[PDB]
Amino acid sequence: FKNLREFVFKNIDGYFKIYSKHTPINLVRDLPQGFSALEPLVDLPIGINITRFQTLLALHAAYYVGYL
Amino acid sequence: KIADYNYKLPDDFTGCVIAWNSNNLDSKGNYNYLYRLFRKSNLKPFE
Asked: Which intervals of the chain are annotated as region Immunodominant HLA epitope recognized by the CD8+ (chain B)?
């Protein structure tokens, strides 16, 4: 599953910052070593206080979660 | 009450506030227009 989709989500001053980078990997069980950079993608001036986070999935999926 | 519960501004707010008197366009006793009077904490900016 080479499409490794890394994302960073931040809600600062009523703005949503999205950083992403799609890179080809071959280690799905764990996170491969190395270095990369995530580029700014979208700025969303919403104004919502986000305290909970829920992934939306299609239904008739292994992922990772850290904190900054 | 207003600065903390109804509309909260950042303390570094670089902006302008414009007030339009509308006694002829909003007054009735118009009850549909309220204000927030009580709250346990202070609002965040853009909340």
From this structure: 30-38
- The kind and range of the H/E element at B23 are helix B23-26
SS3 call for A7? strand
Q: Report yes or no: B46 and A47 within 8 Å, Cβ to Cβ.
A: yes
Contact of A4 with A38, CB cutoff 8 Å? no
Q: Do B47 and A47 touch (CB under 8 A)?
A: yes
d(CA B43, CA B38): 12
- Is residue A14 within 8 A of residue B45, CB to CB? The reply is yes
Closest-CA distance of chain B to residue A47, Å: 5
Tokens of B46: 């853009």
The structure tokens listed for B13 are 């707010």
Amino acid present at B8: K
* Expt. technique: cryo-EM
Amino acid in position B15: G
Tell me how far CA of residue B5 lies from CA of B8, B27, B29, B37, in angstroms. Answer: 7, 23, 24, 7
